[PDB]
Amino acid sequence: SNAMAASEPYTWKNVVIGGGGYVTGIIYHPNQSGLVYARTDIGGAYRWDSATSQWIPITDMLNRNNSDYMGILSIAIDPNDVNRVYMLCGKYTQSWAGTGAVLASTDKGATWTIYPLSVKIGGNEDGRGLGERLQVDPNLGSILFMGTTRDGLWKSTDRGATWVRVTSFTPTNINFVIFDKSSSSLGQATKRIFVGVNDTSGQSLWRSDDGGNTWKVVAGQPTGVMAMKAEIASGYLYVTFANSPGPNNATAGSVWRYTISNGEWKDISPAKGSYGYCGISVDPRNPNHILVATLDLWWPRDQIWRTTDGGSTWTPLLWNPSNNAVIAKFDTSSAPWAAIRNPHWITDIKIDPFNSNKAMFVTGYGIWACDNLSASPTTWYFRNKGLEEMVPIEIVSPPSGALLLSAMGDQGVFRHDSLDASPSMGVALDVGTAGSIDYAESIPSKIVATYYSAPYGAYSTDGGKTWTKFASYPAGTTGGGTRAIAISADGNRIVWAPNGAPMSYSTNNGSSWTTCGGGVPSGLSVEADKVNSNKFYAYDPVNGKLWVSTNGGVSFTQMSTSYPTLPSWQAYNGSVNAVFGREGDIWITCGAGGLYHSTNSGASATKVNSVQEAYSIGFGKAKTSGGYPAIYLHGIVNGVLGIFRSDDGGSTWTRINDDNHQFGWIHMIRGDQRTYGLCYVSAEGRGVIYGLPTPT
C-alpha cells in the first residue's frame, strides 16, 4: 500500500471531443451481456458502461514510470470467469525500448496486477491491429498463450503470473493465436491451437493438435500473403490475408475458409484488388453471418462486406462498387469533427454475441457501431463517448472567448466553447498535426498556431473561429515545432522556433520573419511575458540556461543562472512559464533538477525547495482576490508522483489527484483564469482531462 497523505478530493473528466486515435481491438464477452472491452495503441484500454452509455478508461493508474503499458497489443477475457480480463502491454520493440508486461484483473479492470515480462511488446508498431495475440484457454482458464512480435510464443499455466517460452514454436513474429474450444471439454487443456505469423511464403498459418507441444505448417494455405486474423465456427477456420501486417501498405489479400477436419481450402474473398483484408467477425450465433473489412483500400474508401450464406454471396455495406456511391449512413452528431475522416484502418470488427443485428468496428480515429445490420442501408454511429485518444501537443486556456484551445496530433486545432460537448464546428483549423498554440494575454482574441506543412503556421483575430495562414515562414523551416511559438501580450509580435530554422520574430503577423540575434539556441520552446510585450523567454534544458529578450524578440541574452541540466532526450522536462498578470514572474521546470522561480524577468532564479521534481507547471485563478494565482504542478513532491496545487505561491502543496488518476504520460498542465480549482491536463493518447474539486 502507498502512503495516503493529505489531498483534496478531485473529480477528473475528459474534455469531450471524441475518439481521435487508433483503436486496435474490441472484445465482446461471450458469457455476460453488456460486457465489452476496447484496446488502443497509445491510450490504454476501455470498458463499455451501458448504464451511462460511454466507455470507461481502465488504465489511468499507469503513470510516468510505466506509461509504455498504455500500448495495448492485445486484450483477452475468460469465458468461464466474467470478472477476469488480461492485457498484453507495451509500445515498442526497438533497442531503446523497455520490456512489456501482462496486466491481470479480477474486477473487470478496476485494479490490475502488473507482471513484467522479459520480452518487448509492440503495441504501437506495425501489425498492432492484428490479433488477438493473448488468449485464455476456453476450457481450462489457468492456461494462457501469448504471441509476441520478436520472441515467438509463450505459455502460462498460472493465469499470466509466469511465462515460459514454447520452444517447439520456431517462428518469432506472431500475428495472432486462436483456440478451437471444441477440441477439449471443460477442465482440460484445449488441444487444437492455430497461430498466424508474419510470413508471406506460405508458412504463416501453423496448427497444433496436442495443446501446443508440436506444430506444423497448414498445407494448402495461400502464398504471397500472411494470416491476419481468424474466426472458428462450425468446424471452419475463416482467415483474412494480406501482404502486409498493416495498418498500412497492404496491396494484396484474400479471405479463405479452412475445413479443420479434412484440411480443405475454399477462397471466399468478396473482391480482390490492390488491398488486403484483416477485420473479420463470424456471428457467434449464426456461422453463416460474417463481416469482413478491407485494409488499405484508400480510393474510393475501405469496404465492409456482409454475408448471410457463409460467403457464397457478399453485400457491400459502406459503398456500392457499381458507381462508388456511399450508401451507409454515418452519424457524427456526437463528434462533428470526425466527419473530416473516412473509415479506415478497419482492422477489427465484431458482431454482438447477444444481438446478431448489432456490431462495432474500429478505425484510426475511433469506434463505429451499427444497431441494425439488417437495415438497408445500415446506419453507423460514432460511439466514442468517454473514449478520448488524442495527443494534445499544446493547450491554452484564454481568460475570455473559448474555455480551451487544443493543438492535436493528426487532427488539427480545436476550439472548446464547452468541456462537456464536442466542438460544434468540428476542427477549428484543418491542418493535421498541430504542435503549438498561443494567445496574446492582453488581446486573447489573437491566437497563433503551428503545424507540419508549409507555411507551417497561422493566426486568428477572433479567438480561433476564423484563421488565415502565415504569408511567409522562416527560411529553412521544415516543421512548425512543438510548443514553439509565443505571441506578445499586445498581439503585435510573434517569436517562433520552428524545426529546421533558427528562432525568428515577426512584427506583421507572419508576413515577414527575421532571425533573432544574440546566439540563442534554436528549437527551444519560447514563452511570452503575460504583461510586457517586449519580454520573451527561452529555456535551454541541455545547458540549463535561460535566455531572455527585452526588445520584443529582436535579440536574446543568456542569464547567468546555472539551472540543473537535462539530457537531450529528456529536454521535454525543461520549460519556462510566465504567470498571467505578473510581469517578469516566470517558473522554470528542470525535471529531476526541481522547480525554480524568478520574479525579476529571469535575471536571477531561486530553487523551490518544496518540490522534488517538476515536469510541467500551470497557473489559474487565485482562491481569494489579491492572492497569488493558484499553481498547478505535475511532478514529484515528497517522493509522491502526481498532480499538485499550491495556494500560497509555491511553499506548500496539496495533491489534487490519486494513484488511480495519473493518466500515463502527462505532456503539460494549465490552470483556468475564470474558475478556481480548475485544472487542464494533456495526457498522451488520453486527450485533455480536466479536474475540479469534488463537492462535499
Ligand X SMILES: OC[C@H]1O[C@@H](O[C@H]2[C@@H](OC[C@H]3O[C@@H](O[C@H]4[C@H](O)[C@@H](O)[C@H](O[C@H]5[C@H](O)[C@@H](O)[C@H](O)O[C@@H]5CO)O[C@@H]4CO[C@H]4OC[C@@H](O)[C@H](O)[C@H]4O[C@@H]4O[C@H](CO)[C@H](O)[C@H](O)[C@H]4O)[C@H](O)[C@@H](O)[C@@H]3O)OC[C@@H](O)[C@@H]2O)[C@H](O)[C@@H](O)[C@H]1O
Task: Give the nearer residue to ligand X in terms of CB position, either 204 or 433.
Answer: 433
Q: Is 410 a catalytic residue?
A: yes
Q: Supply 141's cell numbers.
A: 482458464
Q: Are 290 and 238 in contact (CB under 8 A)?
A: yes
Name the minimum Å distance from CB 624 to ligand X: 43
Point out the residue whose Cβ comes nearest to ligand X: 364
Candidates 197-205, 335-343, 509-517, 547-555: pick the segment binding ligand X (CB under 6 A).
Answer: 335-343
365 binds ligand X (CB under 6 A): yes
Name the minimum Å distance from CB 411 to ligand X: 7
433 binds ligand X (CB under 6 A): yes
Contact pick of 83, 243, 286, 342 for ligand X (by CB under 6 A): 342
Name the minimum Å distance from CB 530 to ligand X: 30
Task: Give the nearer residue to ligand X in terms of CB position, either 190 or 477.
Answer: 477
* Sign of the Cα pseudo-torsion (166, 171, 177, 183, in order): negative
- Give the footprint of ligand X on residues 21-40 (CB under 6 A): 21-22
x/- mask, ligand X, residues 199-238, rule CB under 6 A, reads ----------------------------------------
In DSSP terms, which residues pair with 546 in a beta bridge?
539
Task: Give the nearer residue to ligand X in terms of CB position, either 172 or 251.
Answer: 251
Sheet containing 349-351, strands listed edge to edge, beginning at the edge strand earlier in sequence: 329-331, 379-382, 366-370, 359-363, 349-351
CA separation for the pair 111, 107 (Å, rounded): 7
Candidates 104-112, 340-348, 533-541, 568-576: pick the segment binding ligand X (CB under 6 A).
Answer: 340-348
DSSP one-letter string for 205-257: EEEESSTTSS-EE-TT--SSSEEEEEEEETTEEEEEEESS-SSS----EEEEE
Task: Give the nearer residue to ligand X in terms of CB position, either 79 or 432.
Answer: 432
Name the minimum Å distance from CB 196 to ligand X: 23
Q: Is the bond leading into 8 cis (omega within 30 degrees of zero)?
A: no
Q: Which residues make Cβ contacts (< 8 Å) with residue 338, sequence separation at least 6?
A: 18, 19, 332, 365, 366, 382, 384, 426
Q: Where are the beta strands (DSSP E) in 29-117?
A: 36-40, 45-49, 54-57, 72-78, 81-89, 101-105, 113-116
Contact pick of 92, 330, 381, 452 for ligand X (by CB under 6 A): 452
Contact pick of 353, 432, 518, 523 for ligand X (by CB under 6 A): 432
Q: Is 49 a catalytic residue?
A: no
- Strand 379-382 versus strand 329-331 pairing type: parallel
x/- mask, ligand X, residues 633-672, rule CB under 6 A, reads ----------------------------------------
Distance of CA 163 to the CA centre of its chain: 28
Contact pick of 109, 131, 160, 364 for ligand X (by CB under 6 A): 364
Helix/strand/coil percentages in the chain, nearest 5: 5, 40, 55
Q: Are 354 and 342 in contact (CB under 8 A)?
A: no
Candidates 64-72, 94-102, 338-346, 552-560: pick the segment binding ligand X (CB under 6 A).
Answer: 338-346
Q: SS3 for 464?
A: coil
x/- mask, ligand X, residues 370-409, rule CB under 6 A, reads ---------------------------------------x
Amino acid (1-letter code) at residue 564: P
Q: Is the bond leading into 629 cis (omega within 30 degrees of zero)?
A: no
- Strand 134-136 versus strand 113-116 pairing type: unpaired
- What per-residue string of b and e applies to 342-367 under the rule 16 or more CB within 10 Å gives b? bbbbbbbbbbbbeebebbbbbbbbbb
127 binds ligand X (CB under 6 A): no
Name the minimum Å distance from CB 364 to ligand X: 3
340 binds ligand X (CB under 6 A): yes
How many residues bind ligand X (CB under 6 A)? The answer is 16
Name the minimum Å distance from CB 435 to ligand X: 8
* Sign of the Cα pseudo-torsion (400, 404, 409, 413, in order): negative
Task: Give the nearer residue to ligand X in terms of CB position, either 346 or 528.
Answer: 346
Name the minimum Å distance from CB 248 to ligand X: 5
341 binds ligand X (CB under 6 A): yes
Q: Supply 571's cell numbers.
A: 529536454
Name the minimum Å distance from CB 249 to ligand X: 9
**In whole angstroms, how large is the CA radius of gyration of the chain?**
27
- Give the footprint of ligand X on residues 575-614 (CB under 6 A): none
Name the minimum Å distance from CB 269 to ligand X: 22
Task: Give the nearer residue to ligand X in terms of CB position, either 92 or 354.
Answer: 92
Contact pick of 344, 350, 383, 530 for ligand X (by CB under 6 A): 344
The catalytic position among 49, 410, 430, 490 is 410
Name the minimum Å distance from CB 152 to ligand X: 27
198 φ, ψ (degrees, to nearest 5) = -75, 100
x/- mask, ligand X, residues 148-187, rule CB under 6 A, reads ----------------------------------------
- Strand 679-683 versus strand 557-558 pairing type: unpaired
The catalytic position among 41, 137, 283, 585 is 41
298 binds ligand X (CB under 6 A): yes
Amino acid (1-letter code) at residue 283: D
DSSP one-letter string for 282-351: EETTEEEEEEEEEES--SS---EEEESSTTSS-EESSEETTTTEE-SEEE-TT-GGGGGS-------EEE
183 φ, ψ (degrees, to nearest 5) = -85, -5
- Give the footprint of ligand X on residues 408-427 (CB under 6 A): 409-410
Name the minimum Å distance from CB 43 to ligand X: 10
- The catalytic site residues sit at 41, 410
Q: Which residues are near ligand X by CB under 6 A?
A: 21-22, 248, 298-299, 340-342, 344, 364-365, 409-410, 432-433, 452
